Structure 1
């Protein structure tokens, strides 16, 4: 009796700038994150993805590594600056890498899930305004259409955007991520142009009518808890919940922005980008939703720079990210989507994982027992989601290997495989061996 069906997809995930390296090889030009990493202080210790895990050169070994673990699906992102290193200038050599990457995956029985945009916007695009420029909808559409045309016979599962909350609010309001702006109004406009660009790709994808091929989007979602019973903390929680979750779930799946947040934001910034025709493109029917889940937020009333909600530390065990380990919110979010937003639409966990202080023992092993127990606890919640009727199709662990964790640089290790960056040596962590056994047995 299986807890995960034979059709269930046990997978792992990466992103192009986090693992590839070869940042200027074969015609790749800079992305906003190459640029951001070279601005003083914007990435911890001035780390950058010049080399990363060198997955661009080592991909055959990395696919062979995944085969030997039993991995059934691999979620990766395609580097826009590799494909169009300049506006209107296609680079065949860049496509060739994803063609041979994909071919190696298929020969090794691994199903490719390709993320179209995972934050590595071409610098030429940002120099024209980037996501603040409404014309990015066409540039993104042409980019997506090129991928569908050249790879659509071999990649059958497509994700338009990874975590637009990060590309918008974290990049243009908080400013921790590239391009690092700090203007709420720009963040709101960016969030709309991202969703509109996603809708353009979906429209193009449907026009092509490719056989047995599916499209969706990936959202990082949390569950928000008020710190107290008070009405002021409940209001703070509604703000945080709409800030993180509802601002993207409502337009995608209801066809409108959450009206309370339209009202709230409207006291501080312009919200005049909303209109009916844009929202119809944004709310097109998807084949699946990918969920990125890591932690919950406990908020109380106040304002410390962001909005009118202050996140607090409730006092339980956290990862090296400072993120609380709270597995039950994974079930609560999945069930909330089933009840209020996605109904019986296929759902995927496109990212879940944890960063811990991994050390290689003198015998060559990594005993990351905290990561093993982390993943055990969350797969148990996925198993409970399935038992209660949830349409969960797969689970992508973040990450296959230690990589470049954005503004943290290489200081945070998410992999089930350890990477010694001086030698690029890969070392299976105990969590990888645990994952391999979970895939073989399919019971937890």
Structure 2
């Protein structure tokens, strides 16, 4: 077999992107409910009030996954369902994740739970959010409650999804909630996110849950200089430090990357760095989840102003270059520089294309079939070169709410007709079903 029977073929979603039921069974608003109601923040003022209605349709969706042969399901847990007010636990919110995970297990699907996938409760943001160091304790209490109530259901835990997005994209670029534009704030948020991750790991190890694993998920790219010039080499180094090393180094080396500490320090405070915090941040993990989509080609441009070059190759509807070799290059880089023999999962990879249901009732998404084929071939090549890849989760199970793009970008292997909430298997889902069945590519 190209992929062993123990290899996990998975799919992934996130709570606010698919669940809907935004005001039901005690759920209160997250920063994204609020953000999507602010004019100009989200495409056509789309929001996740209803999304895919997965909260109500979860049994049908699990049956769909079973019929595809899905072996693992990565989802996130909505903090505002579990603690809809500070210190106020909501058993009805917990009950959803129990019946969801009970359904998954009874259909032979391994649950992978993301504790935080960007839907911070509005009550927490009103108290300062990720800028308030006290969030470390709020997050730890939330995580401990999940570990204690769901530890018999879920054995694979992910603390945070893509902390680069929750920090720089949300507080510096301002495209994501809460939408600040302040480099110093983004840097502090990145530190408090990592410290909160560390607190959850410390709680996790103290519980000593049998056969349970914990990790984190990072979106990673590969940065190419546009030319062999020294200017473009420095630009690539900064861009690589900004996207990848700012998170990889504290997690796996116990130290922020010094070139970036000095670079950022020309523009903002970096005084949050201290030894005690970096010891918590760098606690040993059981696995690393890698979210990979594309590379960047950069030339010198100013503060983080590298011009992004278009190398003229095929792209997705996001404008992201289709460059499968960087999946292998990034996995090898981790093996050789950061994670060594530690298990790796691809916790997201996928693509947005202009999907259309044709008169035959089918979605002939050939470009997504070819995209996934090329990237799974690179995963296979990593394995046959000795990489410790344990699974691969396609983003996404279904079309969903794509953050600032609303519903205009479709990432699913399953098409959702939002008017009816009908699920339509795309050709990529049928291709994936065959890959799982044959384990051959």
Instruction: With the length of structure 1 as denominator, give the TM-score of the two structures.
Output: 0.99
8 Å CA contact retained: 1:161, 1:218: yes
8 Å CA contact retained: 1:354, 1:414: yes
Q: From the superposition, tell whether residues 411 and 306 of structure 1 become closer, same or farther in structure 2 (CA, over 3 Å).
A: farther
Per the TM alignment, residue 308 of structure 1 is displaced from its structure 2 partner at its CA by 4.0
**1:295-314 matches, cutoff 5 A:** 295-302=294-301, 307-314=304-311
Per the TM alignment, residue 310 of structure 1 is displaced from its structure 2 partner at its CA by 2.1
Q: 2: CA distance between counterparts of 1:148 and 1:177?
A: 28
Q: 2: CA distance between counterparts of 1:333 and 1:369?
A: 26
Q: Match of 2:115, SS?
A: strand
Q: Could you tell me which runs of 5 or more consecutive residues in structure 1 were left unpaired when the two chains were aligned.
A: none
Q: 1: CA distance between counterparts of 2:181 and 2:153?
A: 40
Q: 2: CA distance between counterparts of 1:286 and 1:369?
A: 38
Per the TM alignment, residue 244 of structure 1 is displaced from its structure 2 partner at its CA by 0.1
2:365 matches 1:374: no
Q: 2: CA distance between counterparts of 1:309 and 1:196?
A: 29
2:424 matches 1:427: yes
User: 1:230-286, CA deviations, whole angstroms, 9 ceiling, x for partnerless residues?
Assistant: 000000000000000000000000000000000000000000000000000000000
Q: 1: CA distance between counterparts of 2:307 and 2:157?
A: 36
Q: 1: CA distance between counterparts of 2:205 and 2:126?
A: 31
User: 1:315-340, CA deviations, whole angstroms, 9 ceiling, x for partnerless residues?
Assistant: 11110001000000000000000000
Q: 2: CA distance between counterparts of 1:414 and 1:234?
A: 33
Q: 2: CA distance between counterparts of 1:357 and 1:116?
A: 31
Q: Match of 1:409, SS?
A: helix
Q: From the superposition, tell whether residues 144 and 15 of structure 1 become closer, same or farther in structure 2 (CA, over 3 Å).
A: same
- Counterpart in the other structure of 2:81: 82
Q: 2: CA distance between counterparts of 1:366 and 1:403?
A: 16
Q: From the superposition, tell whether residues 124 and 435 of structure 1 become closer, same or farther in structure 2 (CA, over 3 Å).
A: same
Q: 2: CA distance between counterparts of 1:358 and 1:275?
A: 49
2:382 matches 1:394: no
User: 1:197-217, CA deviations, whole angstroms, 9 ceiling, x for partnerless residues?
Assistant: 000000000000000000000
- Counterpart in the other structure of 1:358: 355
Q: 2: CA distance between counterparts of 1:313 and 1:133?
A: 39
User: 1:373-410, CA deviations, whole angstroms, 9 ceiling, x for partnerless residues?
Assistant: 00000000000000000000000000000000000000
8 Å CA contact retained: 1:161, 1:198: yes
Per the TM alignment, residue 312 of structure 1 is displaced from its structure 2 partner at its CA by 1.9
Per the TM alignment, residue 430 of structure 1 is displaced from its structure 2 partner at its CA by 0.2
Q: 2: CA distance between counterparts of 1:372 and 1:115?
A: 27
Q: 2: CA distance between counterparts of 1:391 and 1:319?
A: 29
Q: 1: CA distance between counterparts of 2:308 and 2:137?
A: 37
Q: 1: CA distance between counterparts of 2:24 and 2:298?
A: 45
Instruction: With the length of structure 2 as denominator, give the TM-score of the two structures.
Output: 0.99
User: 1:21-51, CA deviations, whole angstroms, 9 ceiling, x for partnerless residues?
Assistant: 0000000000000000000010000000000
Q: Match of 2:407, SS?
A: coil
8 Å CA contact retained: 1:222, 1:293: yes
Q: 1: CA distance between counterparts of 2:418 and 2:206?
A: 44
Q: 1: CA distance between counterparts of 2:309 and 2:11?
A: 31
Q: 1: CA distance between counterparts of 2:394 and 2:303?
A: 30
After superposition, the CA RMSD in angstroms is 0.6
Q: Match of 1:410, SS?
A: helix
Q: 2: CA distance between counterparts of 1:310 and 1:9?
A: 38
Q: Match of 2:345, SS?
A: strand
Q: 1: CA distance between counterparts of 2:11 and 2:25?
A: 26
Per the TM alignment, residue 306 of structure 1 is displaced from its structure 2 partner at its CA by 5.1
Q: Match of 2:408, SS?
A: coil
**1:38-187 matches, cutoff 5 A:** 38-187=37-186
Per the TM alignment, residue 311 of structure 1 is displaced from its structure 2 partner at its CA by 1.6
8 Å CA contact retained: 1:223, 1:329: yes
Q: 2: CA distance between counterparts of 1:56 and 1:214?
A: 26
Per the TM alignment, residue 415 of structure 1 is displaced from its structure 2 partner at its CA by 0.2
Per the TM alignment, residue 422 of structure 1 is displaced from its structure 2 partner at its CA by 0.0
User: 1:95-149, CA deviations, whole angstroms, 9 ceiling, x for partnerless residues?
Assistant: 0000000000000000000000000000000000000000000000000000000
**1:268-287 matches, cutoff 5 A:** 268-287=267-286
Q: 1: CA distance between counterparts of 2:237 and 2:185?
A: 22
Per the TM alignment, residue 291 of structure 1 is displaced from its structure 2 partner at its CA by 0.1
Q: Match of 2:97, SS?
A: helix
8 Å CA contact retained: 1:73, 1:113: yes
8 Å CA contact retained: 1:9, 1:394: yes
Q: Match of 1:6, SS?
A: coil
